[PDB]
Design a protein around this nucleic acid. Structure first.
Ligand SMILES: [Ca+2]
Ligand SMILES: [Ca+2]
Ligand SMILES: [Ca+2]
Ligand SMILES: [Ca+2]
Length: 281
DNA sequence: GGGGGCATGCAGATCCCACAGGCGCG
DNA sequence: CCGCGCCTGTGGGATCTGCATGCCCC
């Protein structure tokens, strides 16, 4: 059960990709709940165990027949999470949800949430957090601003990038029809972090940003399709900065196809065998 | 007696992932 | 011609996010 721990910057990078900070204010006088959660497919339960071993907090639960959840609600345990992200701060817009989550923690640590003044402040905090206030709290506390300080941060290091890639990244092989094999690396992200995704082009020395129609599409792609860039830049980066989860296994199969491509790929039966065991198994 | 915290289960919403096709260029 | 890589496009599920209840304890 007790599995390996992970580098704390890799964990923050995975949290930037897959984490969620929650502030629930329900009328059971109001009940206050703070939470951190990650939901993944069972294939990546090892990641949740890795985080649980590194933080030494959190409950791992099956969220159905297909999914697994790591959830932290115990108040003292949320202090462990604050201390981690204070030393290893998030990079995406989720940092703002973390900061509001931390602000809510100080209201509750000072027991102010038991009185009416604390609830009003917690409602103001929740308004700027994630998807904002629900209809009931919008009516019961109409005083309601969703605006919050802007975030525009740079990639802190490659260890963060490995955890981020383990979450939102993708390694795959294309078989285009004469059949040619092409390696592709892609990270997708909501356009709310376009600057950070643009940051990747010079940070990795390769790649392009693709957006489609910016007026009707809320997410973009950072992609590297040039084999020399995959072979000389992306592979050495993630070989030195270990990925986690099945993304690591997909990367290792990905690199097997890369060695074949640098050795005159065209023969192809072994590449098709590796591809069958990638994002299908 | 019960307020408040914790665990728990489930549902809503969407941002991802893992791709494919057309075609200009060296 | 051939192999490549820019560029455009996306289904649908793995995510992110949120709601509700029960039971314990000081
Ligand atoms: Ca993400
Ligand atoms: Ca993310
Ligand atoms: Ca993921
Ligand atoms: Ca993700």
């Amino acid at each position: 059960s007790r599995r390996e721990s992970i580098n704390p910057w890799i964990l923050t990078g995975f949290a930037d990709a897959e984490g969620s900070f929650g502030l629930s204010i329900l009328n059971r006088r109001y009940h206050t709940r703070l939470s951190f959660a990650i939901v993944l497919h069972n294939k990546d339960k090892s990641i949740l165990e890795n985080i649980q071993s590194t933080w030494k907090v959190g409950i791992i639960t099956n969220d159905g027949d297909r999914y697994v959840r790591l959830r932290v609600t115990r108040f003292e345990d949320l202090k462990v999470i604050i201390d981690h992200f204070e030393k290893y701060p998030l990079v995406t817009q989720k940092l703002g949800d973390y900061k509001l989550f931390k602000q809510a923690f100080s209201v509750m640590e000072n027991k102010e949430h038991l009185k009416e003044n604390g609830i009003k402040e917690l409602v103001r905090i929740k308004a700027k957090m994630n998807w904002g206030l629900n209809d009931e709290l919008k009516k019961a506390f109409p005083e309601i601003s969703k605006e919050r300080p802007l975030i525009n941060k740079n990639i802190p290091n490659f260890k963060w990038l490995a955890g981020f890639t383990s979450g939102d990244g993708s390694f795959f092989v294309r078989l285009r029809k004469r059949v040619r094999v092409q390696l592709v690396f892609e990270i997708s992200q909501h356009i709310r972090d376009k600057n950070l995704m643009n940051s990747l082009i010079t940070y990795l020395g390769c790649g392009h940003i693709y957006e489609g129609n910016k007026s009707e599409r809320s997410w973009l792609q950072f992609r590297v399709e040039k084999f020399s860039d995959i072979n000389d830049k992306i592979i050495p980066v993630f070989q030195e900065n270990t990925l986690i989860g099945v993304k690591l296994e997909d990367f290792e199969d990905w690199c097997k196809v890369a060695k074949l491509i640098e050795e005159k790929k065209h023969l192809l039966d072994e590449i098709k065998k590796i591809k069958l065991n990638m994002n299908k198994g």
